[PDB]
Amino acid sequence: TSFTRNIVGRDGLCVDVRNGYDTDGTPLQLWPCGTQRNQRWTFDSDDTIRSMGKCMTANGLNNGSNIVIFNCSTAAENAIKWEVPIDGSIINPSSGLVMTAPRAASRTILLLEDNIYAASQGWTVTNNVKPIVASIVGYKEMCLQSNGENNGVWMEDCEATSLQQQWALYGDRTIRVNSTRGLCVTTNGYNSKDLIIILKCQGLPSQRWFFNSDGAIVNPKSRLVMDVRASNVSLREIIIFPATGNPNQQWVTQVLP
Numbered sequence: 001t002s003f004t005r006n007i008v009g010r011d012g013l014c015v016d017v018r019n020g021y022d023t024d025g026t027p028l029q030l031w032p033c034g035t036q037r038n039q040r041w042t043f044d045s046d047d048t049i050r051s052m053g054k055c056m057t058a059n060g061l062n063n064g065s066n067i068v069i070f071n072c073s074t075a076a077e078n079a080i081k082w083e084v085p086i087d088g089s090i091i092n093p094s095s096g097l098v099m100t101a102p103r104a105a106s107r108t109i110l111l112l113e114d115n116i117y118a119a120s121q122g123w124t125v126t127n128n129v130k131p132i133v134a135s136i137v138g139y140k141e142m143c144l145q146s147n148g149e150n151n152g153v154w155m156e157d158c159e160a161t162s163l164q165q166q167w168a169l170y171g172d173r174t175i176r177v178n179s180t181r182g183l184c185v186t187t188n189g190y191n192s193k194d195l196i197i198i199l200k201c202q203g204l205p206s207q208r209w210f211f212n213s214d215g216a217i218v219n220p221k222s223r224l225v226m227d228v229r230a231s232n233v234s235l236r237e238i239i240i241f242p243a244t245g246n247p248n249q250q251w252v253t254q255v256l257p
């Protein structure tokens with residue numbers, strides 16, 4: 001009924017009990033990923049998430065409350081239950097608040113905050129603590145390609161050698177330029193027809209993505225999906241647009257060697 005994984009989030013760092021202490025009340029933080037026991041989280045059918053035999057616990061259920069480790073039997077029941085939405089949030093059901101890394105740096109302390117679907121609120125429960133590196137193949141079997149910081153992404157004929165067709169799929173639900181991992185696929189607004197470009201990763205809702213079961217790449221805040229504009233590759237414009245199920249919005253990842 002239980003299984004154990006790392007939890008990877010902002011900038012590819014992991015959820016870590018600060019300094020390996022199991023004392024009740026010790027904050028959770030970001031720290032570079034590893035196998036140490038204070039980064040190994042056991043998910044149970046009672047919706048608890050445990051490390052070193054203690055529970056991930058909201059120290060209060062307010063916006064900005066700290067998340068800590070605490071004895072499972074003595075903590076408040078409402079403070080120790082968590083769900084894991086398919087879009088990569090980690091949510092406390094009682095409060096509706098979500099796990100958030102307010103800064104990218106190692107040693108950032110994790111907080112419960114209002115859900116704004118930010119990349120700083122995206123997490124991946126996994127034993128692979130390295131980003132997955134893949135092509136993203138879409139309309140007409142062409143590949144998504146980055147064309148540098150501040151420019152639009154667009155489709156091109158796939159080629160195994162193009163580094164600008166290689167994407168690092170990070171645990172915080174960002175899609176990064178593999179050769180330049182400080183750069184993020186970013187929608188330039190939350191409205192239909194806004195352009196998708198590459199920008200410096202900043203933890204924003206504009207930089208968070210979800211690969212859903214219909215082949216779409218969804219931006220949770222806008223609700224809108226990746227779309228090759230007007231089904232016209234020659235425009236060299238990828239936008240966000242409502243999900244239509246059409247070929248111009250279908251994508252798959254293909255892992256690279």
Ligand SMILES: *[C@@H]1O[C@H](CO)[C@@H](O[C@@H]2O[C@H](CO)[C@@H](O)[C@H](O)[C@H]2NC(C)=O)[C@H](O[C@@H]2O[C@@H](C)[C@@H](O)[C@@H](O)[C@@H]2O)[C@H]1NC(C)=O
Nearest residue numbers: 062063064065100102111112113114115116118120203204
């Ligand atoms: C919940 O906590 C959040 C983090 O402190 C608040 O958002 C932050 O508000 C600050 C300004 O007072 C500022 O640091 C940031 O704009 C913002 N941070 C992020 C990433 O959201 C949030 O405050 C609300 O939302 C912000 C955007 C402002 O518009 C405030 O006026 C809002 O109150 C907190 N929510 C509540 C209910 O206070």
Ligand SMILES: *[C@@H]1O[C@H](CO)[C@@H](O[C@@H]2O[C@H](CO)[C@@H](O)[C@H](O)[C@H]2NC(C)=O)[C@H](O[C@@H]2O[C@@H](C)[C@@H](O)[C@@H](O)[C@@H]2O)[C@H]1NC(C)=O
Nearest residue numbers: 022023024050051052053054055069070071072073074075
């Ligand atoms: C969580 O807090 C519990 C209540 O304070 C701890 O249980 C107590 O542990 C004592 C030995 O450490 C034991 O003599 C007490 O009778 C017991 N109280 C109860 C109600 O069980 C608990 O410690 C764990 O559970 C006990 C039963 C022993 O197996 C300990 O070795 C366990 O650590 C605390 N949990 C943790 C993980 O610290």
Ligand SMILES: *[C@@H]1O[C@H](CO)[C@@H](O[C@@H]2O[C@H](CO)[C@@H](O)[C@H](O)[C@H]2NC(C)=O)[C@H](O)[C@H]1NC(C)=O
Nearest residue numbers: 130132133134166168177178179180181256257
């Ligand atoms: C994606 O980028 C990564 C990170 O720069 C590349 O991985 C490095 O590859 C070199 C040579 O094989 C290794 O010595 C390093 O250890 C790697 N670094 C890390 C942090 O993993 C990788 O080659 C790129 N391309 C692919 C397809 O993954």
Ligand SMILES: *[C@@H]1O[C@H](CO)[C@@H](O)[C@H](O)[C@H]1NC(C)=O
Nearest residue numbers: 229230231232233234235236
């Ligand atoms: C596609 O986009 C290109 C570039 O603007 C344009 O020349 C062409 O007419 C567009 N329409 C179609 C149907 O290809």
